[PDB]
Design an enzyme around this catalytic site. Structure first.
Site, mmCIF file in Angstrom:
data_model
loop_
_atom_site.group_PDB
_atom_site.id
_atom_site.type_symbol
_atom_site.label_atom_id
_atom_site.label_comp_id
_atom_site.label_asym_id
_atom_site.label_seq_id
_atom_site.Cartn_x
_atom_site.Cartn_y
_atom_site.Cartn_z
ATOM 1 C CB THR A 117 -66.990 -31.071 83.883
ATOM 2 O OG1 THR A 117 -67.050 -30.933 85.321
ATOM 3 C CG2 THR A 117 -66.981 -32.539 83.543
ATOM 4 C CE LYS A 203 -75.084 -35.782 88.213
ATOM 5 N NZ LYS A 203 -75.358 -34.385 87.723
ATOM 6 C CG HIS A 241 -71.489 -27.989 91.622
ATOM 7 N ND1 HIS A 241 -71.144 -26.754 91.136
ATOM 8 C CD2 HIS A 241 -70.893 -28.894 90.814
ATOM 9 C CE1 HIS A 241 -70.359 -26.900 90.082
ATOM 10 N NE2 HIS A 241 -70.202 -28.190 89.860
ATOM 11 C CG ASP A 284 -63.221 -32.285 86.197
ATOM 12 O OD1 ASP A 284 -63.117 -32.451 87.453
ATOM 13 O OD2 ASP A 284 -64.297 -32.009 85.633
HETATM 14 N N1 LIG Z 1 -69.584 -38.281 79.797
HETATM 15 C C1 LIG Z 1 -70.580 -37.404 80.056
HETATM 16 N N2 LIG Z 1 -71.619 -37.185 79.215
HETATM 17 C C2 LIG Z 1 -72.590 -36.299 79.488
HETATM 18 N N3 LIG Z 1 -72.611 -35.563 80.614
HETATM 19 C C3 LIG Z 1 -71.617 -35.694 81.544
HETATM 20 C C4 LIG Z 1 -70.524 -36.645 81.309
HETATM 21 N N4 LIG Z 1 -69.672 -36.597 82.355
HETATM 22 C C5 LIG Z 1 -70.196 -35.680 83.217
HETATM 23 N N5 LIG Z 1 -71.339 -35.136 82.730
HETATM 24 C C6 LIG Z 1 -72.178 -34.126 83.401
HETATM 25 O O1 LIG Z 1 -71.402 -32.977 83.665
HETATM 26 C C7 LIG Z 1 -71.547 -32.607 85.060
HETATM 27 C C8 LIG Z 1 -70.323 -31.859 85.530
HETATM 28 O O2 LIG Z 1 -70.355 -30.513 85.070
HETATM 29 P P1 LIG Z 1 -69.891 -29.312 86.016
HETATM 30 O O3 LIG Z 1 -70.353 -29.622 87.419
HETATM 31 O O4 LIG Z 1 -70.585 -28.140 85.367
HETATM 32 O O5 LIG Z 1 -68.401 -29.295 85.858
HETATM 33 C C9 LIG Z 1 -71.832 -33.929 85.749
HETATM 34 O O6 LIG Z 1 -72.439 -33.764 87.019
HETATM 35 C C10 LIG Z 1 -72.733 -34.641 84.739
HETATM 36 O O7 LIG Z 1 -74.073 -34.184 84.871
HETATM 37 ZN ZN LIG Z 2 -65.835 -31.367 86.572
HETATM 38 ZN ZN LIG Z 3 -68.962 -29.017 88.581
#
Ligand SMILES: Nc1ncnc2c1ncn2[C@@H]1O[C@H](COP(=O)(O)O)[C@@H](O)[C@H]1O
Ligand SMILES: [Zn+2]
Ligand SMILES: [Zn+2]
Ligand SMILES: *[C@@H]1O[C@H](CO)[C@@H](O[C@@H]2O[C@H](CO)[C@@H](O[C@@H]3O[C@H](CO)[C@@H](O)[C@H](O[C@H]4O[C@H](CO)[C@@H](O)[C@H](O)[C@@H]4O)[C@@H]3O)[C@H](O)[C@H]2NC(C)=O)[C@H](O)[C@H]1NC(C)=O
Ligand SMILES: *[C@@H]1O[C@H](CO[C@@H]2O[C@@H](C)[C@@H](O)[C@@H](O)[C@@H]2O)[C@@H](O[C@@H]2O[C@H](CO)[C@@H](O)[C@H](O)[C@H]2NC(C)=O)[C@H](O)[C@H]1NC(C)=O
Ligand SMILES: *[C@@H]1O[C@H](CO[C@@H]2O[C@@H](C)[C@@H](O)[C@@H](O)[C@@H]2O)[C@@H](O)[C@H](O)[C@H]1NC(C)=O
Ligand SMILES: *[C@@H]1O[C@H](CO)[C@@H](O)[C@H](O)[C@H]1NC(C)=O
Ligand SMILES: *[C@@H]1O[C@H](CO)[C@@H](O)[C@H](O)[C@H]1NC(C)=O
Ligand SMILES: *[C@@H]1O[C@H](CO)[C@@H](O)[C@H](O)[C@H]1NC(C)=O
Ligand SMILES: [Ca+2]
Length: 777
Positions: A117, A203, A241, A284
């Site tokens: 992400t 979130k 997820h 993304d």
């Molecule tokens: N702008 C942001 N600042 C901090 N954490 C974020 C942000 N945008 C997304 N996230 C976190 O990153 C997660 C996504 O990561 P992933 O599922 O590992 O790709 C989301 O579910 C949020 O918890």
């Molecule tokens: Zn993502």
């Molecule tokens: Zn993810």
């Protein structure tokens, strides 16, 4: 009927009964008048209370309203929205489907590696590969900083991690205003500053609240109104997820995403902006199914596990004792110990420099040397206690179909009812700059390659000017005595055979037409070279590397002396030549040919290929791959594709930055000589998308390209083939090392296709195309 007017305290929609209602404490979203003057309205307000037609019920059909000089740009990301969701569920998402029907959409948008992400959102707003912008994973270590980075830590807000220039700084530096409703990096003081407006990540904020505030920024006075704004929601990633990408739960989350976007579009319509705002909706990365039954464990490969592992879909391995042992840590031993251990390992280990070059994943100290490329749907983890193995995840190779992202666009800057082929998310930054009439900071997108999405492209690409024009290789005498150590006893009249290398002007032009049908490569590197014209092939021979920069020939549809016969080339000065003696017997390297002699007609033609200007130093184990490719695979390709134009050559990328380097940089040579050893060998295959045509009578808009950047390695352990008695592994190995023509150009300093009679921007599309087999195979 309290309920339908207890709804406001929990709903964001202007239900039928509340059109006109009385303001109370407190409604999140407000029907009806005075909602409008108060700019409090539920986005459906007019369709649902004024009986106007909602955006959704409308038909597809450049008019920004009062005080909107230039089109505002909105960048909307839906985390984890894989391209596949759009292809199969579009009718479950009416608002996105309208958008897809009426605007411009891509078949898919490719993410960068690793498909995570923070990596990909930051790439989207900078146009940069992760190795350059520095966010190379959601979890990483930096030995120079001696600092850890994580998604749940405050180190992540440290500006030292975040390189490059995000679109909100590009706008701000050039006099515009940018507002981010959540975006990775937006809460960081990158280059010492923030977006004009930004939100502290939470979130829990209702997606609806995020849309309403974006609508309010558009309602701001022109002096404070943002020209660029971002919108971000965590679905479908969160549910993906938990339940995996093929689940009723994800479809529910996608509908909730669809309603989020619906609210935004109705709000724009309400404000008469629907044909004012340019909107990009994308993701993304995608989402893939995992199982606790599909885990590879480091414990199965190591009796002792004395290391730190970033686990999962894009693993890395590093010393546990950092930074003391960061460099002494034996990454090569780790990779070797993980290599070819079980017949069907569900990952492959790599040093970063041996990763497919298309991944551009090596040139950063944060990219630990040990990388694991994991099979789709599997995870590589330390031990059997690993717990995060159910539902879905992402991180894999960006070629996998499950990792592909959506890309939809709509607004006056974009074509209508238009579907474009897939493209890479690195291209989007230049696109956004164009839509905001900004000059882009230097990036990895190819500016102009997306002009076919736009109604009136703001940027018109320029051809690269050659930096190095050719020098002359003069015909001359055979040296006497000939101390090359070369031998070709079959030749009876040597002066006659060598005159075949000295073509008349019309023979040169014929060769040029048949073998360089798209023009000769221009040389942007500073290189001394000359052009060698031959009947069946042409090359640019360079004294700087004692070999061709490139070699080009065309083989038609349908149709092997190695060092039984080889001789010096009389057009090349001896001191600028490879010799047969240079290839001494005690060696792991043997001469390979760029134009294969097995393609020339027997007789005098074959002598034209058997010269020391047509050879490149090859590891014997790579030659095995190379010979099988050109003797067996290439003729089959040519029969399938009705001929092929072939251009091939060496790459030297010893500092592994993805670019050509000064010649001083080469660190490996054929033993006892100054013949440089390429890190890679490139091959670019051009034919016609319409196979009724040949590579020579194809309309330029219909060319088909397949390029490879083959690692020049001393063994075939990447293919687990050194003990293999066949060569059926070669095709698979080559398939994971395809590349864009643009990758080849960056690594060689060459510029291809300069003579194509079509707009430069069309040729740029061709050059950014990535050939992919893995989802077909
Ligand atoms: N702008 C942001 N600042 C901090 N954490 C974020 C942000 N945008 C997304 N996230 C976190 O990153 C997660 C996504 O990561 P992933 O599922 O590992 O790709 C989301 O579910 C949020 O918890
Ligand atoms: Zn993502
Ligand atoms: Zn993810
Ligand atoms: C993806 O796009 C990015 C953005 O263009 C690109 O990153 C750039 O890489 C180049 C070269 O690899 C970097 O060039 C450097 O320029 C900086 C400016 O601060 C200088 O510090 C460096 O000078 C060195 O090199 C000279 C060579 O002549 C040496 O003589 C000298 O001693 C220096 O060591 C260097 O030229 C450029 O800084 C970055 N830009 C950013 C913003 O990171 C990247 O290369 C692209 N990736 C691919 C694969 O194309
Ligand atoms: C370049 O040569 C090195 C070294 O060759 C060895 O030492 C030289 C001085 C000479 O005496 C050679 O006959 C020796 O073999 C090569 O490294 C060798 O690699 C092979 C594996 O391919 C291995 O069996 C030997 O142990 C290595 N020798 C040493 C001392 O490391 C290297 O492979 C050669 N590279 C090329 C271009 O062929
Ligand atoms: C392949 O091309 C056939 C020949 O059409 C002619 O040549 C092609 C390249 C085009 O330039 C076209 O303008 C010419 O009329 C077509 O008849 C055939 O339909 C094409 N195949 C496909 C799938 O389109
Ligand atoms: C970074 O994290 C590692 C654990 O992965 C730890 O050993 C190291 O001491 C940490 N370094 C700093 C500076 O926090
Ligand atoms: C940092 O900001 C300064 C001041 O505007 C600007 O000149 C420079 O280009 C910025 N650097 C980057 C990497 O964005
Ligand atoms: C985050 O948003 C939620 C939902 O609106 C809210 O209840 C909470 O107060 C916010 N948390 C913080 C730390 O601001
Ligand atoms: Ca380089």
């Amino acid at each position: 009927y309290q309920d339908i007017c207890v709804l406001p305290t929990q709903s964001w929609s202007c239900n039928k009964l509340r059109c006109g209602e009385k303001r109370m404490a407190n409604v999140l979203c407000s029907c009806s008048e005075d909602c409008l003057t108060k700019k409090d309205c539920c986005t459906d307000y007019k369709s649902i209370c004024k009986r106007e037609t909602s955006w959704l019920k409308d038909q597809c059909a450049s008019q920004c309203p009062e005080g909107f000089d230039q089109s505002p740009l909105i960048l909307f990301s839906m985390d984890g929205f894989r391209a596949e969701y759009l292809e199969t569920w579009d009718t479950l998402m009416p608002n996105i489907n309208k958008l897809k029907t009426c605007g411009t959409h891509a078949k898919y948008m490719r993410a960068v590696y690793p498909t995570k992400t923070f990596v990909n959102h930051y790439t989207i707003v900078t146009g940069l590969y992760a190795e350059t912008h520095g966010i190379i994973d959601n979890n990483m270590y930096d030995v120079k900083l001696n600092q850890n980075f994580s998604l749940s830590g405050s180190n992540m807000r440290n500006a030292a991690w975040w390189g490059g220039q995000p679109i909100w700084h590009t706008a701000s530096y050039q006099g515009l205003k940018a507002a981010t409703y959540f975006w990775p990096g937006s809460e960081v003081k990158i280059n010492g500053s923030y977006p004009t407006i930004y939100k502290v990540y939470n979130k829990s904020t209702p997606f609806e609240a995020r849309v309403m505030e974006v609508l309010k920024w558009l309602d701001l006075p022109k002096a404070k109104r943002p020209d660029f704004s971002t919108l971000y929601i965590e679905e479908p990633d969160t549910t993906g997820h938990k339940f995996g990408p093929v689940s009723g739960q994800v479809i529910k989350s996608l509908q909730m995403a669809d309603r989020t976007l619906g609210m935004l579009m109705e709000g724009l319509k309400q404000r008469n902006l629907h044909n004012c705002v340019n909107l990009i909706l994308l993701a993304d990365h995608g989402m893939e199914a995992i199982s606790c039954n599909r885990l590879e464990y480091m414990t199965d490969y190591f009796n002792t596990v004395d290391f730190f592992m970033y686990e999962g879909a894009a693993p890395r391995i590093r010393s546990k004792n950092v930074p003391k042992d960061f460099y002494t840590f034996d990454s090569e031993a780790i990779v070797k110990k993980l290599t070819c251990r079980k017949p069907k390992q569900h990952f492959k280990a790599y040093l970063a420099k041996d990763l497919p070059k298309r991944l551009h994943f090596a040139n950063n100290i944060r990219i630990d040397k040990v990388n694991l490329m994991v099979d789709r749907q599997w995870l590589a983890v330390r031990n059997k206690k690993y717990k995060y193995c159910s539902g879905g995840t992402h991180g894999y190779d960006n070629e996998f179909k499950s990792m592909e992202a959506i890309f939809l666009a709509h607004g006056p800057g974009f074509k209508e009812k238009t579907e474009v082929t897939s493209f890479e998310n690195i291209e989007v930054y230049n696109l956004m700059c164009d839509l905001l009439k900004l000059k882009p900071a230097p990036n990895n997108g190819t500016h102009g390659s997306l002009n076919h999405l736009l109604k009136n492209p703001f940027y018109n690409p320029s051809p690269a000017k050659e930096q190095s024009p050719p020098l002359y290789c003069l015909f001359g005498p055979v040296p006497s005595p000939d101390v090359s150590g070369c031998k070709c006893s079959s030749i009876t009249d040597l002066e006659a055979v060598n005159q075949r290398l000295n073509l008349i002007d019309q023979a040169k032009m014929q060769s040029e037409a048949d073998n360089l049908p798209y023009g000769r490569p221009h040389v942007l590197q500073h290189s001394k070279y000359c052009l060698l014209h031959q009947t069946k092939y042409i090359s640019a021979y360079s004294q700087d590397i004692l070999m061709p920069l490139w070699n080009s020939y065309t083989i038609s549809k349908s149709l092997p002396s190695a060092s039984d016969c080889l001789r010096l080339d009389v057009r090349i000065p001896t001191v600028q030549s490879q010799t047969c003696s240079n290839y001494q017997p005690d060696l792991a390297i043997t001469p390979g040919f760029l134009y294969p002699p097995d393609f020339s007609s027997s007789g005098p033609e074959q002598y034209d290929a058997l010269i020391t200007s047509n050879i490149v130093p090859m590891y014997k184990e790579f030659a095995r791959l190379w010979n099988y490719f050109h003797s067996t695979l290439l003729p089959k390709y040519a029969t399938e594709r009705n001929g092929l134009n072939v251009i091939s050559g060496p790459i030297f990328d010893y500092n592994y930055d993805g670019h050509f380097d000064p010649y001083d940089t080469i660190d490996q040579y054929v033993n006892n000589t100054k013949i440089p050893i390429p890190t890679h060998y490139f091959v670019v295959l051009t034919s016609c998308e319409n196979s009724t045509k040949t590579p020579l009578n194809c309309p330029p808009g219909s060319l088909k390209v397949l390029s490879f950047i083959l690692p020049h390695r001393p063994d075939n352990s990447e293919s687990c083939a050194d003990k293999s008695p066949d060569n059926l592994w070669v095709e698979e190995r080559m398939q994971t090392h395809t590349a864009r023509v643009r990758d080849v150009e960056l690594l060689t300093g060459l510029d291809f296709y300069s003579a194509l009679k079509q707009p430069l921007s069309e040729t740029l599309r061709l050059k950014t195309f990535l050939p992919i087999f893995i989802n077909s195979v």
